[PDB]
Symmetry: C2
Subunit: 271 residues, 2 copies
């Protein structure tokens, strides 16, 4: 019964493209509001800007305060930067797409944490927001491989793609309020906060090849940083099955050859 | 040569496995033993391999004395020395490692799988090569880490399943008719002594599952118990009752704790 039906809060391609899907299939611009993230400067770059799309397309920019009293508003967080408190809202139609295969890897830096912890797969999960961090009941989840030479930046782009997708898969039943959900288990639940990750990663070479490789490629996301070996930035790590002896470490002009305690060949490419 | 087999290592896995060969396969005369450096020659919370051997007129030797024995079966059962295979005339060199290889190579394997959130572990019979726990897998038996198992419980499961896999496989080892498969690069992990601080400092900005896991991974009373506010902890119980996020309350006999997802932990203080 209110004029505003939906708020998209967050950033990057996932937010912008999801918003474009709703504008095309579901709601007119004047039934939509957005809350861009604090660091959104309105500039299209290696990602699309939600603030810029909103301005371009005459969608009103609001704050949380302005939406708390809108009854029945659908609130959708797509890489939103604020932890909400659900008791502020009259609506209970509050959703998030989280970049991991919940209940694993709640929290932040989820293009880093699964790689660093030796996962072969990750996922995106659509869930209701409750007062905890990525703790709410799951509505849908899509799992996908972390390929053996995927970097954190590669995995991030997979989150964006599969996330956008899981949004489109589910938005109808969310708008109809006909969706199903299930509470998260206690077991397998894991969480990382910013203080658990040191973005200047010091590599522990007394590790297997797999682990050394994981350690490198988990911090490859050039827009933010690259890992450093012997004062050289690394742009790609390649892990092979080839046995080359234990604890190999050789610096060349364009790359390092590395093996860990199990002796499998890594090529770490310089930038 | 008269000597057919060396059993090297410690604890009930080594003693019972030796008793089983002495009963079914070889005479005392055909067996030599290398205890670990720390073997006291008395029974304690585990039986002494040194004592068993001396009690049964099985000769105690060093690695030097066996290198030259043609065709000897060398069988490590929690042995404390990394061998170098080119020292030996025989290539019949075997180990039972207490993990589900290729995961959790190295040490402290009753801690590492719990601390890294595993639901299961395993024992793995493999050939020894020059790396640590790297050689080809001959057999493996996987079993659960129950939700409230401690490191101590895990260890006693390794000794039991470890003894069993020895008994299952030993004839084919004697007859050299066993089969094996090289280990994969993927999923391979390793922990060395320096990776684990046996005086664990709990990170409470984690899930209840992780906090519980941190506690119970260090419960091994013969060595240490984890400490919370100066009380030693003997048992951690994780329930799927929601009690609020980030609870911490101390009582006389226990703590009530929840992490970021709010599930109830009871940490029982040692009596
Ligand atoms: C800031 C930063 C990011 N990254 C990489 C890894 C990150 O997973 C990826 C995306 O970073 P970004 O700052 O957008 O967020 P993130 O930590 O993954 O995601 C968290 O922060 C978002 C604002 C929240 O919406 C997310 N909430 C989800 O339910 C949260 O998981 O960029 C670096 O390698 N280095 C960096 O310094
Ligand atoms: C020394 C020590 C051990 N433990 C626990 C954790 C560990 O998994 C278990 C057995 O201790 P260990 O016998 O020192 O063996 P560990 O599991 O480190 O195994 C390692 O050392 C032995 C001697 C090798 O044969 C074995 N292949 C290695 O994996 O006891 C503790 O909790 N605290 C300790 O201080
Ligand atoms: N209610 C609630 N609000 C949400 C989500 C939720 O699922 N629950 N899902 C999204 C979560 N977004 C985040 C998640 C974490 C942080 C964050 O900033 N974490 C800090 C920790 C802050 C703290 O300890 O509380 C850190 O890692 O250092 C910020 C936005 C959006 N809003
Ligand atoms: N060849 C080789 N020898 C072996 C085994 C093997 O599968 N391969 N299997 C058994 C493994 N026993 C161990 C494993 C690790 C240590 C150990 O002492 N590790 C040190 C690291 C030592 C190092 O880096 O050299 C540490 O963690 O600080 C000792 C005995 C017995 N001997």
């Amino acid at each position: 019964g209110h004029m505003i039906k939906i708020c998209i809060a967050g950033k990057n391609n996932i937010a912008v493209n999801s918003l474009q899907f709703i504008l095309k299939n579901y709601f007119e611009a004047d039934q939509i509001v957005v809350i861009p993230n604090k660091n959104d400067k309105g500039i299209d770059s290696w990602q699309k800007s939600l603030l810029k799309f909103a301005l371009d397309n005459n969608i009103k920019i609001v704050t949380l305060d302005e939406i708390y009293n809108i009854e029945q508003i659908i609130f959708f967080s797509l890489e939103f930067d604020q932890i909400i408190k659900i008791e502020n809202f009259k609506s209970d139609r509050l959703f998030n797409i989280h970049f991991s295969a919940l209940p694993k890897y709640k929290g932040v830096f989820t293009s880093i944490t699964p790689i660093l912890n030796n996962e072969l797969e990750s996922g995106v999960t659509l869930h209701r927001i409750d007062n905890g961090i990525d703790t709410g009941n799951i509505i849908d989840q899509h799992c996908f491989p972390i390929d053996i030479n995927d970097t954190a930046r590669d995995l991030y782009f997979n989150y964006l793609k599969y996330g956008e997708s899981i949004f489109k898969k589910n938005i109808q039943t969310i708008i109809n309020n006909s969706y199903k959900d299930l509470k998260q288990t206690n077991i397998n639940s894991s969480y990382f906060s910013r203080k658990d990750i040191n973005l200047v990663h010091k590599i522990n070479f007394k590790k297997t090849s797999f682990e050394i490789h994981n350690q490198i490629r988990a911090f490859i996301f050039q827009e933010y940083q690259l890992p450093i070996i012997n004062n050289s930035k690394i742009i790609k790590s390649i892990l092979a099955n080839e046995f080359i002896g234990y604890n190999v470490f050789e610096e060349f002009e364009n790359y390092f050859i590395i093996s860990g305690i199990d002796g499998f060949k890594i090529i770490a490419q310089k930038l």
